[PDB]
């Protein structure tokens, strides 16, 4: 009952514990590299020409 | 020039405030789309009337009374008189309409939304304005109001004097149309509103007692200033024409001037809601 629900959770946590983890440095480096690489086509960040904007 | 020095600031002070108390109200109403409601259109019309009155008739009257010589044409002087009458008679029916709207809102709450709509407000405003105009341009452009005695004829013949001289009938028609009729309606409206407020307070007191100055103050601040400002003028206007040699020109013009300052107290009275004050604080 409650014991059964606990078993259901008891099994679940163990499964979510056997995973491979990567150092935060590599993830941060990848994130910043992607953000810097795709920072030249964002109209919000960089103002586009006035004639280009359909709303103008 | 001690008398001259003084009136100059005082006539000067009144002109700036009246436009100031009008342009601020109108720009606060126009700038924000929230302040607008059916109950704001009448206030907008009243503010516009006060603005045009204070921007047209006050400086001309001050110049006429200070210089003691009218240097413009007779036609322009007649136009000045007509526009003064128009503004004076249009700055009262708006208050009457506001009172009637409040009466309908309080006494009949369920049907208030259906009774008043954005389309009917424009019709009411146009009707009030045209009623005011029918007694300002139509009888003044023509010569229905002219007097008969020699002094009036001499003044109209000369191109240097502008003194209001009028036939007995006109005085009692214009006064009745402009002041006396829009008074009893407002008195009845406010009596009914006060009765309803007292009934509600008595109802709540019995229900939640163990576990009014506000209404009196609110009605006083609305009625007393208006009656004090516009009562003496609309009794002297009829007593001086029923019989002669009773009222001097000095007191007449003084009462006329004291009536003009009422248009500047409207922004400080009818715009005391916190939403109204928020716009003033922002700007």
């Amino acid at each position: 009952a409650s014991i059964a629900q606990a078993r259901k959770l008891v099994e679940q946590l163990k499964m979510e514990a056997n995973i491979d983890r990567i150092k935060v440095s590599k993830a941060a480096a990848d994130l910043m590299a992607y953000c810097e690489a795709h920072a030249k086509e964002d109209p919000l960040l960089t103002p586009v020409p006035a004639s280009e904007n359909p709303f103008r | 020039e001690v008398w001259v020095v003084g009136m100059g600031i005082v006539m000067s002070l009144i002109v700036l405030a009246i436009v100031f108390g009008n342009v601020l109200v109108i720009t606060a109403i126009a700038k924000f789309e929230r302040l607008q409601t059916v109950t704001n259109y009448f206030i907008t019309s009243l503010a516009c009337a006060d603005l045009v009155m204070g921007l047209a008739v006050v400086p001309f009257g001050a110049a006429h009374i200070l210089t003691k010589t009218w240097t413009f044409g007779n036609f322009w002087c007649e136009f000045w008189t007509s526009i003064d009458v128009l503004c004076v008679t249009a700055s009262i029916e708006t208050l009457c309409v506001i009172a009637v709207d409040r009466y309908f809102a309080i006494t009949s709450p369920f049907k208030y939304q259906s009774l008043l709509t954005k389309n009917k407000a424009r019709v009411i405003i146009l009707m009030v304005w045209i009623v005011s105009g029918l007694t300002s341009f139509l009888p003044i452009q023509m010569h229905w109001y002219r007097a008969t005695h020699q002094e009036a004829i001499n003044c109209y013949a000369e191109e240097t004097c502008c003194d209001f001289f009028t036939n007995q009938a006109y005085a009692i028609a214009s006064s009745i149309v402009s002041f006396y009729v829009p008074l009893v309606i407002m008195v009845f409206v406010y009596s009914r509103v006060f009765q309803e407020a007292k009934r509600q307070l008595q109802k709540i007191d019995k229900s939640e007692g163990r576990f009014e100055h506000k209404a009196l103050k609110t009605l006083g601040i609305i009625m007393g200033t208006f009656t004090l400002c516009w009562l003496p003028f609309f009794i002297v206007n009829i007593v001086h024409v029923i019989q002669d040699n009773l009222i001097r020109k000095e007191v007449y013009i003084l009462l006329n001037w004291i009536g003009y300052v009422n248009s500047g107290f409207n922004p400080l009275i009818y715009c005391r809601s916190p939403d109204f004050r928020i716009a003033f604080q922002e700007l």
Binding site: - | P109, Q200, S207, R210, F211, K214, T218
Partner: protein, 224 residues
């Protein structure tokens, strides 16, 4: 060509606007009110969401039920900040069987941030059976002393033992003691005595709602 295409695009906007304008008056005319109560309070007999429509003297009311589920934490309350009035249905029959939970629920509702302005109407349903329970288990046995309570003379006993009237008055004042503190004048609570025998209770609802609207309008123009 492009002019031709756009011109039709102009036509579509106009027809919809005419309908939105037509529907605006219908939306503004109706008055809506929520019905809320604890379990076994008799809300279902009185009446997932069950929207009921009725007309009283050319006044449109749209009564929107809330539904039934065990939800200690409620998050749909934010959706009901425009309700004209909230109907509360509570039963005094459960005093020995429990009202205290209903009182706690009422206290939680009254102090909610999203419901600061909306008033509450309370119905004391199941009051008919209270007489049998009171006269031949008593309230005085509980920690709140029914016996020590002094019966107010303001309440008029309708056509009649004093014990049942005193019990009804005490139970009624129990909710008002909670309600009056946090009201601050913005919103009030309307007590009422109701039962299934009462052939018409709408008249009472109409008189309460009209007074609520009148008081709100009076407070808006700085007259109260």
């Amino acid at each position: 060509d492009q002019r031709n295409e756009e011109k039709a695009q102009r036509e579509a906007n106009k027809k919809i606007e005419k309908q939105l304008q037509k529907d605006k008056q219908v939306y503004r005319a109706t008055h809506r009110l929520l019905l809320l109560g604890a379990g076994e309070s008799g809300k279902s007999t009185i009446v997932g969401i069950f929207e009921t429509k009725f007309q009283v003297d050319k006044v449109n009311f749209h009564m929107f039920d809330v539904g039934g589920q065990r939800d200690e934490r409620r998050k749909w309350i934010q959706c009901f900040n425009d309700v004209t009035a909230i109907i509360f249905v509570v039963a005094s029959s459960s005093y020995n069987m429990r009202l205290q939970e209903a009182l706690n629920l009422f206290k939680s509702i009254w102090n909610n941030r999203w419901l600061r302005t909306i008033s509450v109407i309370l119905f004391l349903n199941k009051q008919d059976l209270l007489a049998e329970k009171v006269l031949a288990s008593k309230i005085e046995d509980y920690f709140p002393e029914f016996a020590r309570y002094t019966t107010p003379e303001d309440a008029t006993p309708e056509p009649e033992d004093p014990r049942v009237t005193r019990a009804k008055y005490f139970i009624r004042d129990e909710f008002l003691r909670i309600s009056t503190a946090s009201g601050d004048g913005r919103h009030y609570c309307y007590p009422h005595f109701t039962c299934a025998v009462d052939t018409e209770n709408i008249r009472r609802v109409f008189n309460d709602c009209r007074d609520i609207i009148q008081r709100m309008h009076l407070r808006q123009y700085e007259l109260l």
